[PDB]
Each structure stands twice: as structure tokens, then as C-alpha cells.
Symmetry: none
Subunit: 113 residues, 16 copies
């Protein structure tokens, strides 16, 4: 919990943002003005993600992630690869949270009966 996510409300917030934008890249091809946007949004979403994570996960994210180069406009492929990577990493982080929340709840309910 707190050992992983410092701001739980914020990580899901940005998490849903990254997810629905990912579902947009698949919907229709984009143009340079839109691909250039998602690059800026992906960079800012990670910067905003690290503010809500524990020190351990910040570094892990930096080891796994690859910031885009601001001199070349990425492709619809890169944007899908980069975004879905965060979507899976957050959903696996969240699935780790929900399994531990199950352990804490059932343990107190069993420590009572």
C-alpha cells in the first residue's frame, strides 16, 4: 500500500487518462500535431506519475521507461508501445494492490471470528 503508492487517488486518475488516450491511438491514425501532443502528454503523465509513487517504484519506472526524443515526432506505433507499457505497469501495480487489500481484509475478518 503506502510502501508502493504514496498518492493512490492520483495514480488511478492519471492511469485512466493514459488508458483512454491509448484507446484513441488505435481508433484512427493521427497527425503530427496529435502525435506531438501524446508525446508531451506521455512525458508529463510519467512526471506526474512519479509524484504519486513511493521511492522504490519511481526508480523502477525510470529503469523500465524510455523518454521520447523531442527532436523527432514519434509514430502511432511508438505512442501505442509507450502508452500500453504504462497501462500494463499500472494495472499490474493495481492488481498487486487489490490482492494485498484482500489479504488485509480477510485476515482481520478471520482474526475476529
Amino acid at each position: 500500500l503506502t510502501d508502493l503508492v504514496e498518492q493512490p487517488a492520483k495514480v488511478m486518475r492519471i492511469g485512466t487518462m493514459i488508458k483512454q488516450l491509448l484507446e484513441e491511438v488505435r481508433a484512427a491514425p493521427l497527425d503530427e500535431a496529435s502525435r506531438n501532443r501524446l508525446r508531451d502528454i506521455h512525458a508529463t503523465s510519467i512526471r506526474e506519475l512519479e509524484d504519486g509513487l513511493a521511492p522504490e517504484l519511481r526508480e523502477e519506472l525510470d529503469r523500465l521507461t524510455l523518454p521520447f526524443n523531442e527532436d523527432a515526432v514519434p509514430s502511432d506505433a511508438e505512442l501505442r508501445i509507450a502508452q500500453a507499457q504504462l497501462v500494463g505497469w499500472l494495472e499490474g501495480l493495481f492488481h498487486g494492490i487489490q490482492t494485498a487489500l484482500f489479504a488485509q481484509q480477510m485476515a482481520a475478518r478471520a482474526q475476529l471470528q
Copy 2:
């Protein structure tokens, strides 16, 4: 918690507006006269959204959003990206509210039994 959204009825209202307009750009391409409208609508929707958020979410919303180029009529791609960004940001905002609101309900209902 509720310290995050000051005017819930006002925030969710505009959010539903951004959601249904997002479903329209998906349906069929638009013309220049309408894209300029959605651009104007996108700007005013954020302004009315900031009035209903806390200062912490205000700045965060501004750090994540991208103002349009006043001199160029954006494409259907930009408008889908900008709008879906807000739709995702708001759904993650609400999921943080309801998970804590449900947490409040099952804490008092259990503090009784």
C-alpha cells in the same frame, strides 16, 4: 477527499458534456466550421471545470492539459486526443471519489455491527 472537488454537480455535469461530444467526433468527420466550435467548446469547458476543482487539482489539470493554437483550426485527431484526455482524467477522478465514499459507508456499517 471531498477536499478535491468543490462543486461535484458542476464538475460531473461538464464531464458528461465532454464525454458525449467525444462520442460525436468518433461517429463521422467534421468540417472546419465545427472544429473551430469544438475548440472553443474545449477551452470554455476547462475554464468551467477549474471552478469546480480544488487548487491542487487545478494546477495538476493545467500541468496535464495542452492549450490549442489560436491561429490554426485543429484536426479531428487533435480534438479526439484533447477531449479523450479529459474524459479519462475525469473518470479516474470519480473512481477515486467512489472508492473512498464506499470506504466511508462500509466503515460506519461495520462500526455498528
Copy 3:
């Protein structure tokens, strides 16, 4: 909650004490050695009760209650009267708690949906 009972775990403890002691006077008549005990017990439960109640309820309990005389051995009637008076007052205090506890729950659970 905080407006009435300061130490909830302590109040329902002593109450369940006084409750089961009341079921003993009904079970069989007592002798001087036991009546003198229940009076001594009844005094201490009230002193331990005032420590666990809010200032307003302390006075109300003091205005309603009648301390026993420490020179005459009370009857089985007084002990039933004195104790059952508290049992009803404690059950009425908790029913005041639980009616609001459901209000806190069913209102927060409804403020979400």
C-alpha cells in the same frame, strides 16, 4: 458518536457487565453478603461509566441516578430497580448511537451512487 460516548469500547463492556448481573438478581433471591456486593459493584460501574461518557451525559446520568446509602443493606427490589434503570439507559444510549451510525453509512453510500 463523539458527541455522547468518549470511550465506546469501555461503555458497552460495563453495560454487558451490569446487564448480566441484573439477570442474577432475577434468578434467585440474595442474602446480605451478596446484596452488599451488588451495591458496591453498582457504585463502581457508575464511576467507571462517568469516565466513559461525555460531560452532558455525565450530568444527565447524575440527575437521574440515586446513589445508595452506605449504612443500610438494600433489598433485592432496589438492586433490580437500580441496575435495570441503567440497562435501559445504556440500551437507549446505544440505540441513539446505532440510529445515527446507519444515517452516517446510508448517506455516504448514497452520496456516491
Copy 4:
């Protein structure tokens, strides 16, 4: 919370012993040889109970309880008053424990959904 009861398995063990022995004093009258036994059992049972309680509950248990007189064999009435007192005090202790432990189970299960 569980800071109140240090050895729960031990506190409830001795409690169950005092409860069923109480069911014996009600079942049939006793003789001096058996009344003397319960007094000895009553003394050691509280000593073993205080070892399993927190210091605050020790004092409260000590402020509420009454050590027997070794010079007089108590009556079947005294032993019922003394024992049921602890039975009521012990059942009220757990009711404080189970209501908060039940609160832990539903609050964490709600912080997830």
C-alpha cells in the same frame, strides 16, 4: 485496540472456564467443600486474567472486582454474583473487540472496490 488484551487465547480460555462454572452454581446448590473450591478458583482465575489484560484494563478489572474473605465461606449467592460479574465484564470486553475487528474487515474491503 488489541493493545487492550495481550493474550487473547488466554483471556478467553479462562473466561470460558468461569462461564461454565457459573452454569454449575445455578444447576444445583453446593456444599461448603465445593463453595470453598470456587473461591480458590475465583482468585486464581482473576490472577491469570490480569496477566492477559493491558494495565489500563487491569486497574479497571481491579477497581470493579471484589476479593473474597478467607475467614468466611461465601454463599451460593456470592459466587453467582462474583462469577457472573466477570462473565458480563468479559463478554463486554470481546464485544468491544469484535465490533472494531468487524469494522476493519468491511473498511479495507471497501477501500478496494
Copy 5:
């Protein structure tokens, strides 16, 4: 678990023996030939009980229990007090085991899903 009971199968065995013998003393009065039996059985059952308990509980049982004098034939009262005392202590020990057994099962079942 093992910190409390070394031979679980044996303690529930002797326990059911002590319980049904307790239910016989209540059924009809006994004679010196029968009262003398239960004393020897109660003495041997405790010796056989200590073989099946952990070192901590052996000591606790000796502190709570009172061995009979082999110079006077006890009463139907004494035999009921002695036996029911063991019955509650064993039933409270078992209720302590089963409450913790639920904690072990509901914790591994929750740490998995």
C-alpha cells in the same frame, strides 16, 4: 497451534471423556463407590491431559486446578465443580484454536487471490 497443544487428537479425546462424565453427575446422585471413581478418573485425566499440552499450558493448568485429597470422598458438588472447570478450560482452549485456525486459512486463501 503447536505452541498450545502438542497432541491435538488426544486432548479432544480425553475432553469428550470429561464432558460426558460431567453430564452424568448431573443426571443422578452417586454413591461412595462411584464418587471415589470420578476422583481417580479426574486425577488420571489431568495427568493424561498434561501429556498432550505444550509446556506453557501445563503450568497454567496446574495453577488453575486443585487436586483432590485422597483422604475424603468428595461430593457430587465437588466432582461437578472440578469437572466443569476442566470442560470450560478445554472448550475455551479449543475455541481459541479454531479462531486462529480460521485466521491461518483465510490468510493463505486471501494472500493467493
Copy 6:
């Protein structure tokens, strides 16, 4: 586990015998001619019981049981004591066996899913 009872069909058989005979002494008082029978029946039933038990339980049964005085025809009280002693010992024996027997089943049913 089953290391305890060598002849399960035989141990449970004789047990039901003493159980139903226990229910007969309870129903009505007996005469010297039938008490002498029950004394003989109790002796032969233990002998037939040891053939179906493991050596550890053999001595334990011998440590717990009390052979009758062949001189005096025992009373309805002794016969209730001797018989109910075995009935409790046997019921506690079976619950220890089947509780582990259930453990074998649900462990394999869980090792499959």
C-alpha cells in the same frame, strides 16, 4: 492417524454397543442379576476394544479405565460411570480421526483446483 485404530469396523461396533447399553441404565433402575451382567459385559467389551486399538491407545485406555471389583455387584451409578467414561472416550477418539480424515479430502480437492 489411522495408526490409532487398527480395526475401525470393530472399534465402532463395540462402541455403539456400550452406547446403547448406556442409554438403558439411564431408562430404569436395574436388579442385581442385570448389574452383574453389565459388569461382565463391560469387562469383555474393553478386552474386545483393545484388539482394535493401537498399542499406544491400549495402555492409555488401561490408564484411564477402572476394572470392577468382582466381589461386590456394582450399582447403577458405577455402571453409568464406567460406561459413560468409555462412550466419551470413544466419541473423542472418532472426532480426532475424522477431523484429520476430512483434512486428507479437502487437501486433495484443493491440490487439484
Copy 7:
């Protein structure tokens, strides 16, 4: 058992990431700039996976896995081969672990009844 995976929350986290990225290579063909990303992500994902695995699983993971050739940009085929390999390898690991964890739940739940 649990000694196999040292950091389950971390192993599964990275697992979900690799799984969803696999669903992206499948969705649409990629370009050379994005294929270079997935190769880099594949290398860092395994590096972070071995940190959360025991040495026995490491070597087994290392004996089974195939580092990419850096002088050549892999195909959309290779990236599917490599990733799906881990996804199956990771899903079988949990199914091997969780099936024994389920055995812990039903064996203790049966060791009680």
C-alpha cells in the same frame, strides 16, 4: 513454495506490462523505431523480473530465454515469440504457486472441521 518468487507484487507487475505490450504487437504492424523499443523493454523487463525471482527460477528463466541480436532490428514475429514466451512462463508460475496456496486454504479449513 513462496521461496520461488521473492517479490510477487513486482513479478506480477512486470508480467502484466509484458502481457499488454504483446497485445499491441498483435493489434497492428509496427515500424523499426518501435520494434527497437520493444527489444529494449524486453531486456529491461527480464532484468527486473530476475530480481524478483529465486536463483533456481532465474537460471531456468535464463536457460529458456533468448537475448536479442542488437545489430539487427527484430521482426514483429520475433517480438511476439519472445513476449508470449514469458507470458506463458509467468502464467504457469502463478498457476503452480496459487494451486498450492489454495491447498493451504482448504487443508487448514479441513484441519479445523
Copy 8:
């Protein structure tokens, strides 16, 4: 159980690997770099498979299976044939395991009742 598979957790792991890789060859045709990989993967999976099986199955797998040649790149047909051969053999091995596991469970639960 013990007579067929020595390391059950490992065998269902690799099986779930080989299974999902089989679903990749069906999804799209492969290139020389990917076909060459799956062959290397298939060889290593059998080495990791033989380590986890009983000696009889080691030989049975060796009698049924056909190792690939390391000088020619196999076709999409061979790789489907080779892998699917193992998938059926692994699913058939487990159904032999699971059908007996129900026999062990449903028989011990019936030997108890």
C-alpha cells in the same frame, strides 16, 4: 502423483509456456529468425521438462518425441506439429493426475463419513 511428475509446479509452468507459444504460430506466419527461435525454445523446454518428470516419462517422452535438426530452419508446419504434440501429451498427463486426485479426495471423504 509422485510416480509420474517429480516437480508438478515446474511441469505445468513449462506447459503453459509451450501452450501459449503454440497459439503464436497459428496467429501469423513466421520468419527464419522466429522459426529458429521456437526450435531452440522447444529443445530447451524438453530439457526443462525431462528434469521435472519421473524416469518412465522421461523415456516415454523420448520414445514419442523427435528432436529437431540444428542445421536446417524448420517450417511453420513442423513447429505447429512439434509443439502441439507436447501440449496434448501434457494435458493428457495432467488429466491422468486430476482424475486420480478426485479419487484420493472423494475416497478419503467417504472413508470418514
Copy 9:
């Protein structure tokens, strides 16, 4: 004589009654059922006393005596005080009788010689 006691045989009768009852309260403490009796006895002994005394001594006794209240059970102290008061009053009344009886004898014995 005639001016003091009208029925001397009756007063010495009741006096020995009230006297011997006084030696019982000193012998061992009493219970509510016996204290309630002695109160009833003390009143009836006084009513039967006034019937056997001259009018002057009646009123003297009424000025000296204090009737018990019939709604509260007196203490062993009151009962000791109340009865001993009569015993001293009767023995002083009798010592007045015997001193005059000797005066009648030795004066008539002196008129002769």
C-alpha cells in the same frame, strides 16, 4: 408483688423466653429469616408482658421500650440491644420482688420469736 406483677408465673416464663433467645443472637450471626422472626417474637413477648404486669409497670415499659418498624428488618445489633433491654428490666424487676419477699419472711419470722 401484687402492686408490681399481676401474673408472676407468666412474666418469669416470658422472661426466660426472651432471655434464652438473647443467648442465641450472641451465639452466631443471623439471617433475614431469623432476624425477622425475633422482631415478631419481641413484639409478642411485650404484648404478653403487659398482660401480666400491673398498670404502672405497663406504662413504664412503654416509656422505656421502642417498638420495631415492620417494613425494615433489624440488625443483629438491634435485636441484641432490644432483647437485653428487657432482660435487664425483668431481672431488676425480679430483684425488686425477691428483696421484698425476704422482707416479708424475716419480718414475719421476727414477729414470732
Copy 10:
């Protein structure tokens, strides 16, 4: 004078019987089975006493005495009160008879000299 007691041999007989039983209640505490005897003995002793007394002493004896409540077994305290009452009442009865009888003997011996 002797008209007071109609059957002197019968009254004093029963009186001696009541006196020595009183010395038995003092010697050791009694049980419910023996207390019930003395209550019945107390009732029949008064009945046999009224047959040997004159009507004036009958009603006086009935006005002073208190019949026991057949619905409750009295205590050793009540039986001491009731019996000692009669012993004192009877000893005062004889002292009233013997003092006047001594007066008769010193009147005829003096009417001669």
C-alpha cells in the same frame, strides 16, 4: 397452678427432646435433608405440647410461636431461633410451677411447727 400443665410427664418429656436437638444444631451445620427433619420435628413437637397444656397456655403458646413455611426449607439459624424459643418458654414454665410448689411444701411443714 398445676392446672397450667395437664400432662406434666408428657410436656417435660417433649421438652427434653426439643432441648437436646437444640444442642445438635449448635454442634455442626446441617444439610437440606436434615433441616427438613427438624422442621417436621418442630411442628409435631408443638402439637404434642398443646395436648399437655391448659387452654390458657395453648393460645399463649400459639400466640408466641411461629409455624414454619412449608414451601421453603429454613436455615440452621431459624431452627435455632424456633427451638431455643420453646426451651426458654418451657424452662420458664417449670420455674413458675416449681416455685409455687415449693411454697406449698413450706406451708404445710410450717402450719405444723
Copy 11:
């Protein structure tokens, strides 16, 4: 004389037996074999007493006494009550004999001079 006792030599015989046996029950507590003895002696002693008394006293003794129930071993209390009851009744019968025997002697000695 003959109006009351038919066999004077026999009544003082059995009387002494009943008296010294009474002094034994006080001396030390008894066992069932001894308590059962004294019941048989007390029953036969009354039977042997009735053979030596006049018809009037037979009936009075039967009205005063309470035969024991042969279907329960009396207590040390009952045997003391029953025996002491006869001891006083016999001592009061003899004191009635001695008071009249002196009257017969001193009257004939005075009818001579």
C-alpha cells in the same frame, strides 16, 4: 410407672446404646458403610423400644419419629438429628419416672411418721 414403661430394664438398655452411638457420629465423620449401619440400628432400636413401652407412648413415639427411607444413605447430619431426638425423648421419659418415683417414696415415708 407401669402406665408408661412396660420393660424398664430394657428401655434404659437400648437408651444407652442409642446415646453412645450418638456420641460416635459427633466424634468423626462416617462413610456409607457406617452411615448405612446406623440407619439399620436406629430402625431396629425403635422397634425394640416399642416392645418395652406402654400403648400410649408407642403412638406418641410413632407420631414424633420419622422412619428413614431405605433407598438412600442418610447424612451424618440426619443420623445425629434422629439419634439425639430419641436420646432426649428417652431422657425426658426417665426424668418423668424419677420425679414420680421420688413422690412415691417420700410420701410413704411421710405417711409413716
Copy 12:
């Protein structure tokens, strides 16, 4: 008169023997080897007593006495009961004789004066 005791020197002799042995059981508890002696002595002492009594006293003694169980060793209590029974019965026998012996002495001494 002398028709009752045929051999006075023998009856009194053996009587003193039983008396002094009674004073020995009172002094200290006995062991099984000595209780068997006193039981044997009690049988022969009655046998030698009947030889010195008239047939009427033989049967009467037999109607009052209780033969011991040859197959069971009596307790310290029985021996006191049996012996004290004889001691009292013998003293009452002589006191009846001695009272008549004085009648022979004083009546003949008065026929002279």
C-alpha cells in the same frame, strides 16, 4: 432379674475388653492388618457374650447387632460403630441390673428398721 445374665463375671469381663479396644480405634487410625483383627475380635467377642446371656438377650442382641462382611475389610468408622454399639448396650444392661441390685439391698435393710 438375674434371669437375664447367666454368667456375670464373664459378661462383664468381655465387655471391658470391647470397651478398651473402642478407646484404641479412637486414639489413632489403623491399617488393614489391624482392622482385620478388630473385625475378627468383634465376631468372637459377641460369640463369647451370647454364652453368658439368657436366650431372651441373645436374640435381642442378635436383633440389634450387624455382622461384618467377611470378604471386605471394614473401615475405621464401622469398627467404632459396631464396638460403641456393644459398649452402650452392655452399660445399659448393667445399669438395669445394678438399679435392681440396690432395690434388693435397701428394701431388706428397711424391713429391719
Copy 13:
């Protein structure tokens, strides 16, 4: 010549334009603003070429060429293919012109001598 090219001065003009623009697409990658230009330029260069060619070559050029779709921005690849295609076709036209122009000169230079 006249049968192939109507405006020779114009074709080598636009041809040189297409050639040097082709050398720019090779020189550095382009952006949507530049890729969009070359599409418009390539379309207008073909339109201006057909005005300068004979009817036979106009048709052949349209059969060989593929106009771009104005509703999508082409790649640096498409523009290179489209442009280079024209460059060779124009260079092949000129080599056909130059080979015949040498035939016109050399044949007349030989028709003279």
C-alpha cells in the same frame, strides 16, 4: 522528336525540378508540412508535363502513374518512389530523343560525302 515531345524546352525544365526535389527527400527526412508540399508539387508537375507531351506519351504516363490520395499525408518513401519513377521515365524519354538526334545528324553528315 515531334512525334514524342511537343514542348522540349518545358519538359527538361520540369524534369530538372523533379530531379533536384528528389535529391532533397533523400537528403533529410521530412515533416507533414513538407511531405504535403511534394504531393501538391508532384501532382502539378505531372499536370504540367502532359501539357508538353504528345498524345501518345500523355496516355502512357497516366497508365504508368498513380495520383496520390489527397486525404492522407504520404511518407518519405512514397514521395521518393513517385518522384524517382518520373525521373527515370523522363530520362528514358530523353535518351530516346538523343539517340535519334545523333541518327539525324550522322545520317545527313554521311549522306553528303
Copy 14:
């Protein structure tokens, strides 16, 4: 001879076109949108080539060439194979033309001198 090629200016023209396009596939890798063009261009180039070739060369060209598959977008390898095939086939065609054409020049110049 010159009957081989009916339209020399046209065969060389298209030949130059295919040659320089080959120089583009070599220059940089292509994308699916451009690879699809070269397939379409390759088909129309052969169609325009046969119009300028003799029937013998048509079939020979048709016997040597390979029509593309509609479904698959060819690779940079296929397009290089297909195009270079024609360029080599065409350059060998011209070498057959020019070597005999040069033979005419030296034969007529020698038939004169």
C-alpha cells in the same frame, strides 16, 4: 534482329524507369504504402514492355517473369529481385541489339573501302 523490339524508344524508356526505381529500394527501406506502389508499378511496367517487344520476347519475358500475389505486400527483397531481373534482362537485350548494330557499321564501312 531489330524485329525483337518494336518500339525501341518505349522499351528503353520504361527500362530506365524500372532501373532508377530499383536505385530507390536500395537507397532506404520502404513502408507498406510504398511497397504496394512498386507492385502496382511493376505490373503496368511489364504490360507497357510487352507492347514494345516481339511475340518471341513476349512469351520469353512472360516465361521468365513472376506475377505478384494480390494478398501479400511484397518485401524490399522481392521488389529488388523482381526489378533487377528486368533491368538485367533489358540490358542484355540492348547488348544484343547494339552488338549487331555495330556490326552493320564496320561491315558497310569495309564493303566500301
Copy 15:
């Protein structure tokens, strides 16, 4: 012919200026301040070119050229495209001039010899 270019010295002058500026954009990337210059320079260079071309070339140049967007700063790519467009068009313009100017020089030299 010369009817095409009215001011040859001016047409080539400005052309060389666009050519050498083109060699500068290739040399190093530019900044917004210089791109704004080249954009203005490109506009005036075409204006000064049209003054020196014939009306027919004015339109063709205008039909081929593309005015820049003055609300957006063009890229380094567009400027290379726009400039190279002119550089290619101008060299092709002169090659049409130079081929006819040389044609005049060989025609008069042949009309003389």
C-alpha cells in the same frame, strides 16, 4: 526562345542567390529567427524572378510554386523543399536556353563551311 526570359542577367542573378542560400540550409540546422528571414527571402526572390520572365513562364512558375504560411514559422524542411524546387526549375530553364543558344552557334558555322 529568348521570348521566354526577358532579363537574363537578372534571372540568373536571383537564381544563384536562391542556390547559395539552399547550400546554407543544408550546412547546418537553423533557428526561428533565420527561418523567418528565408521565408521572407523566398517570397521576394520569386517576385523579382517574375519581373524577369515572360508571361507564359510567370504563370507556370506561379502554377508550380507554393506561397508560405506567414502565421506559422516554416521548418528547415519546407525551406529546402521550396528552395530546391526553384533551383531545379531554374537550371531546367537555362538548359532549355543553352541548348538552343548552342544550336544557333553550330548552324551558322555550318552555313559557312
Copy 16:
């Protein structure tokens, strides 16, 4: 001339074909779709080759050449071997022709001087 090549223009055509295709296998690695093509091309080029050679060279070519198998895709090595084998054989065939063409010319040119 006629002794070796029947259709010289055709053989140097296919040779220049086979030669230029060989320079492609060296240029970049191929895929299965291209390797399968070049094999098909190589087979048909030989069939077209045998049509253009003299019968002696046909058989020699068949003795030297090795036709490919049509069920396995050859390697880039085989394709380089197969074609280069022909290219050398063709260049050696042509170099023999040029030496004989040199023989025909120089011998006739010398027969003149």
C-alpha cells in the same frame, strides 16, 4: 560461333539477367518469398538457356549443373553458388567466343596485306 551458341543474342541476354540477379543476393539478405522466387527464376533461365545453346553445350551444362529441389526453400548460400556457377560458365563461354572472333578477324585482316 554456330558450334557453341545457337541464339547468341538470347544467351548474353539471360546471362546479363543471371548476372544482375546475383549482385542482389550479395547486396542484402533475402526472405523465403524471395529465395523461393530466385530458385524458380534460376530453373526457367536454364530452360531458356538450353534452347539457346548447341547440343554439346546442353549436355555439358546438364553434367555440371544441379537442379534445385521444389519442396525445401534453399539458402542464400545455395542461390549464390547456383547462379555464380552459371555466370562464370557463361563468361568463360563468351571469352572463348571472343578469342575465336579475334581469330576470324585477324586471320582475314592478315590475308589481305
